[PDB]
């Protein structure tokens, strides 16, 4: 793969969103990956509905504001024959009755691919596919108050990662000699969190925060 | 006990602080309780050093930015014969070598009292003692993005509560007919979090978030 990738430069990535008081990060992660693949397919960047996922993907295994998996959301889009735009089906940060309307569907997928649990494999996927849905351990104040630089947390778990996010690239920091590699990660905690809503996560440091352990992307 | 208590009105409580990128909430919880008891004793409200706790209370069982217990901090203050002011020993949000200086000690304790694991018992303690150190489950985005009203999270755990905070009172909301009781809780996530750095937590709803399960106060 190349030494540094950033899909935001290529137009694959919508501005940062905010999940608010709802455990819906899986939905934001899934729409981010699907936004990337739809852009690759059509050349149109269109913001997708997390609320559509929160409301409607119960049958595939998701639980609205009480958690879910990106794969289950990709499975729902396949089963459902579509997904509504953010504009047509806006974000409410609470689970409600399904209101999917096929007239406003702007996205499709035919399934998903799970990536092998290795940072080498994640890197090849990020390089060649686009933004990748991943789950991380986000449960430390070091992450809550992250501002800049490469995030490294010596208590980070690589098991049962709670928080769905989006890898949009990777790179390295020139000015630091050791441990200088990072994943470029889009969060769903608003623009005011972290670096404009982004975090540089430690890369190739024993799968820090479990970042490569639950990585996947939708097929469109 | 009375129907509503708020120790902030009585002068027991310093302004809200920010723990930053460090798992030191136990230290903020402990200084808050000790600030309350010292004020009761002397009539002087003095901000106490969390950094002093982070740096120096290893021998009593604490682990700096990787966690700790309020009881271990109360034990350290007893063993150490004092605790420095915030001003003399400022907050750095990282563990460093102990720099305690007895010339700047402004607080003392002779131990601590653990409260029985019941909200009835917590209420009697808050009513008659002052601000009470407690641990809660803070590990949901519903808490991260809490803004106002009574916080209630149907997935909240009452086991292994991670996050040390300070109960400064309790009350009830008039305009709501059911589930209207709350604990008034000081956090250490800055003034910009929650309601000026405070949260109203559901009270008498089956020990929501484990709030009564690890409650204590220092004896001064
Ligand atoms: Zn999350
Ligand atoms: Zn905490």
């Amino acid at each position: 793969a190349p030494r540094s990738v950033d899909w935001r430069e290529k137009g694959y990535v919508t501005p940062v969103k905010n999940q608010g008081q709802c455990g819906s990060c899986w939905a934001f992660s899934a729409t981010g990956a699907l936004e990337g693949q739809m852009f690759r397919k059509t050349g149109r960047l269109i913001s997708l509905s997390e609320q559509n996922l929160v409301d409607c993907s119960g049958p595939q295994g998701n639980e609205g504001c009480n958690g879910g998996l990106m794969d289950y959301a990709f499975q729902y889009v396949q089963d459902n024959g579509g997904l509504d735009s953010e504009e047509s089906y806006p974000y409410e940060a609470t689970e409600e009755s399904c209101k999917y309307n096929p007239k406003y569907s702007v996205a499709n997928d035919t399934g998903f691919v799970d990536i092998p649990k290795q940072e080498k494999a994640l890197m090849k996927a990020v390089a060649t596919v686009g933004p990748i849905s991943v789950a991380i351990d986000a449960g430390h104040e070091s992450f809550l108050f992250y501002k800049e630089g490469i995030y490294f947390e010596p208590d980070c778990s690589s098991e049962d990662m709670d928080h769905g996010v989006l890898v949009v690239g990777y790179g390295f920091e020139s000015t630091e000699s050791d441990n200088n590699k990072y994943w470029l990660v889009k969060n769903s905690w608003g623009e005011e969190w972290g670096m404009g809503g982004y975090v540089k996560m430690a890369k190739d440091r024993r799968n820090h925060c479990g970042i490569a352990s639950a990585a996947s992307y939708p097929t469109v």
Side-chain angles (χ1 to χ4, degrees), chain A residues 46-118:
Chain A
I46 308 175
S47 188
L48 302 174
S49 177
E50 294 80 23
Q51 197 63 46
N52 195 166
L53 300 178
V54 169
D55 291 354
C56 305
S57 67
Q60 293 66 26
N62 295 321
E63 298 179 66
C65 291
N66 313 96
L69 294 184
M70 294 78 81
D71 289 352
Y72 298 167
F74 301 145
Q75 187 61 58
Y76 164 82
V77 177
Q78 192 192 332
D79 298 352
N80 185 67
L83 186 68
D84 287 339
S85 65
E86 184 79 65
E87 183 190 338
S88 78
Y89 199 157
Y91 186 65
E92 309 295 340
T94 188
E95 187 183 347
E96 340 246 38
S97 64
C98 189
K99 296 166 189 76
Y100 174 73
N101 186 345
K103 203 202 212 214
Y104 294 113
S105 168
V106 295
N108 55 78
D109 74 48
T110 56
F112 59 88
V113 167
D114 290 325
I115 292 141
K117 313 183 175 191
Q118 294 102 41

Side-chain angles (χ1 to χ4, degrees), chain A residues 88 109 111 123 129 139 164 172 185 193 199 212 217 220:
Chain A
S88 78
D109 74 48
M123 183 176 56
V129 171
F172 64 97
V185 173
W193 178 84
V199 53
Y217 63 85
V220 303

Side-chain angles (χ1 to χ4, degrees), chain A residues 151-180:
Chain A
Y151 177 68
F152 179 76
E153 172 46 73
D155 191 67
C156 231
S157 169
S158 296
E159 291 290 323
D160 300 296
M161 302 81 59
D162 230 28
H163 187 62
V165 291
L166 190 75
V167 176
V168 297
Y170 59 85
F172 64 97
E173 285 191 321
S174 287
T175 44
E176 174 59 14
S177 67
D178 295 310
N179 296 304
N180 54 51

Side-chain angles (χ1 to χ4, degrees), chain A residues 184-202:
Chain A
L184 191 53
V185 173
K186 190 193 191 197
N187 202 354
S188 53
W189 289 356
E191 286 179 359
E192 307 81 0
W193 178 84
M195 281 183 42
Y198 286 83
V199 53
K200 295 181 185 156
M201 301 278 305

